[PDB]
Amino acid sequence: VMNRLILAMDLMNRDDALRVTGEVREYIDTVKIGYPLVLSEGMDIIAEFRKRFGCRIIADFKVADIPETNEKICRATFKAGADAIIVHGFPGADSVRACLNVAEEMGREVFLLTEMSHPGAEMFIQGAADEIARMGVDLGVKNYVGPSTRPERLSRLREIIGQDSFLISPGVGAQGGDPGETLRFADAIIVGRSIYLADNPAAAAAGIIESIKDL
Amino acid sequence: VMNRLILAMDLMNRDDALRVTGEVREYIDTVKIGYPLVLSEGMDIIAEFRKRFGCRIIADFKVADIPETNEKICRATFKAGADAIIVHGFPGADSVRACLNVAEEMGREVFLLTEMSHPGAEMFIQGAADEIARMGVDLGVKNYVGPSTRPERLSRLREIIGQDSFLISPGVGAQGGDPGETLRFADAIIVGRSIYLADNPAAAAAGIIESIKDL
Ligand SMILES: Nc1cc(=O)[nH]c(=O)n1[C@@H]1O[C@H](COP(=O)(O)O)[C@@H](O)[C@H]1O
Ligand SMILES: Nc1cc(=O)[nH]c(=O)n1[C@@H]1O[C@H](COP(=O)(O)O)[C@@H](O)[C@H]1O
């Protein structure tokens, strides 16, 4: 992705989301859109962004249902124009396979979320995360999400998935993660609030990129 | 809930969803709306249903994000008119607390999903599920979701949460669960496909209710 930086656009107002995304578009080629924006403004926002900005869109829906419902969610999301969807691995292999099947049908991609970035991830997810990652490898998953806030965990995840798999990582900035350290293991960093709540989002994005180029 | 039966309305077309829900409305007072319908027709469908049918709406969004994003998702969902939201417990206590805080702010309810009904739930969720349930109790959660497909698990969940907590249970019908056995432990059953894909949804709902009354 452009500059190894993916914008997490979690503003809940179309006008604000469009403003900020336009201001930082010169510094990214990929926007992650999640439920805060989608549930406030509608799924039509995905195609609007994809057209206006000519970006890739990752739908951060953390799909976490039974196989049959997962299929439906994925199909609706790809129909709306998303390039990729983020899926939880904790519901197990059949749930993940359902998403992979729809992605294969529709020429899209699945990102498997393996270990989350927030403190509560330590309670249940972290102890399962290596196994979840190995399950991804065994299902043929090629795209993964793991936590900027725990680079030792992010290193272990990279170790499991290998150097060919694509790994993106949230938790940079607001949650305490560091761009450069995260990029030792991840291919791209996800950044939300540190950009979209900044007084000058373009300057915030530029500052991050300047530290990325230095690596 | 009316007749201890909650409709899982996972049709993806507004016309079909309205038809079926209207046909079975005499047999329920509660409709569970999830992402298949919401992502296809918009969040405005929630208020439309609530008005047309005068039902309670549970938003089955299986909220599974970091605390900050969870807050946003819950707020958007309650703003749309949902009475309650289903939250995953696997992301840990801070993620659940974020949802509880918004529910307290907005006079709504959280349902904690503890153990899922599909086969893949055995891989990671089942081994954490008792702990997830105990975490719910310790957070003051009063409403829970557990699996019709494993009534021994559903009994253990009931044992942890006590007799005062409200427990609803999916996996009845299409996934193999039985109404009567499930209602030994759950207060209400969730039923989707066995009703909404039936040639006669009203007759399917009536048949289920007739077996519920017999208990
Ligand atoms: N996909 C995620 C997985 C995860 O482990 N943590 C995380 O924060 N996210 C999402 O990344 C973004 C983090 O944004 P920020 O902390 O930089 O504002 C938000 O959209 C989260 O909902
Ligand atoms: N909330 C859920 C938790 C769960 O463990 N299993 C489950 O199927 N659900 C949901 O309940 C409904 C099951 O519907 P059906 O199997 O009766 O069609 C669907 O909306 C699922 O997405």
Name the features.
protein-ligand complex, alpha/beta, homodimer, globular, lyase
CATH-assigned fold name of chain A: TIM Barrel
Spell out the helices and strands of chain A N to C.
EHEHHEHEHEHEHEHEHH
Cα-based radius of gyration of chain A, to the nearest Å: 16 Å
Basic shape of chain A: globular
How many helices of chain A in DSSP terms?
10
In the sheet with the most strands of chain A, the strands line up as: 1-2-3-4-5-6-7-8
Which band does the percent of strand residues of chain A land in? Answer: 15-25%
Protein chains sharing the most extensive interface: A-B, 49 and 49 residues
CATH class of chain A: Alpha Beta
Number of domains of chain A: 1
The CATH superfamily of chain A is known as: Aldolase class I
Question: What are the bound molecules?
Answer: 6-aminouridine 5'-monophosphate
PDB class: lyase
Keywords: protein-ligand complex, TIM barrel, decarboxylase, pyrimidine biosynthesis, lyase
Assembly: dimeric
Entry title: Wild-type orotidine 5'-monophosphate decarboxylase from M. thermoautotrophicus complexed with 6-amino-UMP
Characterization of the model:
- 2 copies of one chain form a homodimer.
- By secondary structure, chain A is α/β, with parallel strands linked by helices.
- The first copy, chain A, has a single domain (1-215), classed as TIM Barrel (Alpha-Beta Barrel).
- In chain A, 47% of the residues lie in helices and 18% in strands.
- The first copy, chain A, is built from 10 helices and 8 strands.
- Chain A has helices at residues 14-24, 35-41, 44-53, 67-79, 93-106, 125-139, 151-161, 179-182, 193-196, 201-213; strands at 5-9, 30-34, 56-63, 84-88, 109-113, 143-145, 166-169, 188-191.
- Chain A has an 8-stranded parallel barrel, surrounded by 7 helices.
- The first copy, chain A, starts with a strand and ends with a helix.
- At the A-B interface, helix 2, helix 4, helix 5 and helix 6 of A face helix 2, helix 4, helix 5 and helix 6 of B.
- One 6-aminouridine 5'-monophosphate sits between chains A (8, 10, 34, 60, 86, 113, 116-117, 145, 147, 170-171, 173-175, 190-194) and B (65-66, 69).
- Chains A, B: Keywords: Decarboxylase, Lyase, Pyrimidine biosynthesis.
